[PDB]
Amino acid sequence: HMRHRTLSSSPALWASIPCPRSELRLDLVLASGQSFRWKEQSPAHWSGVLADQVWTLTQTEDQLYCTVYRGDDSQVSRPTLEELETLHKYFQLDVSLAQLYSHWASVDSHFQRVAQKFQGVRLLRQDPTECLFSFICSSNNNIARITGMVERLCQAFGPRLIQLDDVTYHGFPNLHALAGPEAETHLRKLGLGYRARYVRASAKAILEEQGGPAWLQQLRVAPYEEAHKALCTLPGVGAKVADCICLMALDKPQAVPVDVHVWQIAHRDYGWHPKTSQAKGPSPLANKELGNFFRNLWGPYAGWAQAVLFSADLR
Ligand SMILES: Cc1nc(C)c(-c2ccc(CC(=O)Nc3noc4c3CCCC4)cc2)[nH]1
């Protein structure tokens, strides 16, 4: 019935945002393990869902073209200003990535080499709910498997938005959908495994102990230190997952998630070791030290610099 759009197929439905390639490269951002809801359905065209709406995104050297599928049998048209403001805030284009890319590299000979090839890797401003349960699904996993777990989760529990070609799109579910007495067994069948317990338990915990999605908006305005400790009370959410949420959803640019991939990068590319801590390998105290090393090295936007290295280490 409906179909995925491209820029040549129907240019009347697209709207442009002025954006240099040095500020944003979609191919290095949308599938670099921040969001798991974007797929290149057509070449150079990234389709995905963003707060109960489907988008398709493409670009030139200095323009970010975008088109919206509103669904609900509505009148097909260009994106509105309010809708393009949502996209402008999603990519965080008010913040200059070029000035960050120069402030990093002043004290970082490694980033200087990496910034040449992988330019325009910016940090997305995601929904807290979507971000939280997506990174509970990330434990001991890869981008391919996580994308599957999140998609199947959204199909079962999330509301239906629109179908395009052979791809039925779903918005991310609310806390109440995941918190019920049937969700763990359902999510296990969908293939989350042990992660099914934490999805349900954290959803039930946020709703009953903390008081619903409003709590995540309190954590947004609350400081990084409090929000991190607060998230660590949740089932299946430790320092790593809390830092992912803090960085990508709660506007904490200094948050540095420490799993094993930063350990590999920090060790191989910076020659870092646990100096103060006696343990040679990963541990709560050593992971905390590694976050402080990168915060001291890069500054208050340390997590944004980490995202450039994560995108570079994948390719
Ligand atoms: C071989 C290989 N190298 C790497 C770096 C991966 C890899 C990448 C990404 C993910 C999903 C994930 O956890 N992403 C992030 N976690 O904290 C951050 C992110 C993205 C950037 C900001 C902070 C899992 C594995 N695989």
Numbering used by the authors: 10 to 324
Task: Quote the original article.
Recent studies demonstrate that inhibition of OGG1 is a promising strategy for the development of drugs against cancer and inflammation.
As commercial chemical space lacked elaborations of our most potent inhibitor, further optimization was driven by reaction-based enumeration of virtual libraries using commercial building blocks. Reagents compatible with Chan-Lam, Suzuki, Ullmann, or amide couplings were identified and reacted in silico to afford molecules with similar topologies as compound 7. The resulting synthetically accessible virtual library contained 6720 molecules that were not available in make-on-demand catalogs. As the docking was performed to the active site conformation of OGG1 observed in the complex with inhibitor 7, several compounds were designed to extend into the additional subpocket identified in this structure. In total, 16 compounds (8-23) were successfully synthesized in-house and detailed synthetic procedures are provided in the Supplementary Information. Twelve compounds showed comparable or better potencies than compound 7. As the docking algorithm did not take protein flexibility into account, access to multiple structures of OGG1 representing different active site conformations was crucial for successful fragment elaboration.
